[PDB]
């Protein structure tokens, strides 16, 4: 298998808003759980041994043995038999304290039709304004249906200069972050989606461009979601993976 190329093709809709994904059409989506099974964050598989997530997801415990990763899932609670559950052996937080972290799996994920890594972007690439991307996860839905199932939403990227305007996020967004969302409201990542992917289709594959991080509420008009800009951390990510 090649990164970023699912074996079940994702559908556009016919996480607040959006729709339930086709099962296994987002095969890099990970559920991050405590040792006792609480889903509290997402993540993205980026190689057989490595998961990318948000650093704030890890504030509850500094010990790798407190965490396990769920791969190949569609449901949140009643997992299918072939799902992979792997304990985490090491945790690496970005060293300038940005909201991104790496989890090393205690055993490499078995790459299957249902478990496939996403592709990383080239270093420091800036996703163009208006690019159509997807977010996925098991987070809160604010009454928009699909609770407990893997959901998706298609969202356009909003360039930082615009989303930092007073009328929107008013200077809060750093250059190592990006904005995505419908400015009229109604679609967003939400609590439980942190750490999961924002992917954009380029040519023939999906490239991981953001990590779900924070927002001013969820799905509010004029308040798009904020994502860690993965391209600004590729050099750090690769250094950790290649040295560990």
């Amino acid at each position: 298998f090649d990164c970023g190329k699912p074996q079940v093709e994702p559908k556009k809709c016919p996480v607040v808003g959006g729709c339930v994904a086709h099962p296994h059409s987002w095969p890099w989506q990970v559920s991050l759980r405590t040792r006792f099974g609480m889903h509290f964050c997402g993540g993205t598989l980026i190689s057989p041994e490595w998961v990318l997530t948000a650093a704030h997801c890890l504030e509850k415990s500094p010990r790798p043995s407190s965490y396990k990763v769920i791969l190949g899932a569609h449901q949140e609670v009643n997992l299918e038999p072939h799902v992979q559950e792997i304990e985490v052996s090491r945790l690496f937080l970005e060293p300038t304290r940005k909201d991104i972290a790496l989890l090393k799996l205690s055993s490499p994920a078995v790459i299957t039709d249902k478990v496939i890594p996403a592709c990383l972007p080239s270093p420091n690439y800036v996703v163009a304004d208006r690019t159509e991307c997807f977010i996925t996860g098991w987070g809160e839905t604010q009454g928009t249906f699909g609770a407990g199932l893997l959901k998706e939403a298609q969202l356009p990227v909003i360039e930082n200069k615009v989303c930092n305007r007073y009328e929107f996020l008013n200077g809060r967004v750093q250059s190592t972050e990006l904005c995505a969302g419908h400015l009229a409201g109604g679609t967003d990542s939400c609590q439980g989606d942190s750490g999961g992917p924002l992917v954009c289709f380029e040519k023939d594959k999906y490239i991981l461009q953001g990590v779900t991080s924070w927002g001013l509420g969820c799905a509010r008009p004029n308040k798009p979601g904020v994502y860690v800009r993965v391209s600004r951390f590729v050099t750090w990510i690769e250094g950790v993976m290649r040295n560990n």
Binding site: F40, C41, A54, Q191, G192, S194, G195, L216, G217
Partner: peptide, 14 residues
């Protein structure tokens, strides 16, 4: 008003 989207979230006064 900034809330990090973990479950539970981490929310801040702005």
């Amino acid at each position: 008003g900034r809330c990090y989207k973990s479950k539970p979230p981490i929310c801040f006064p702005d």
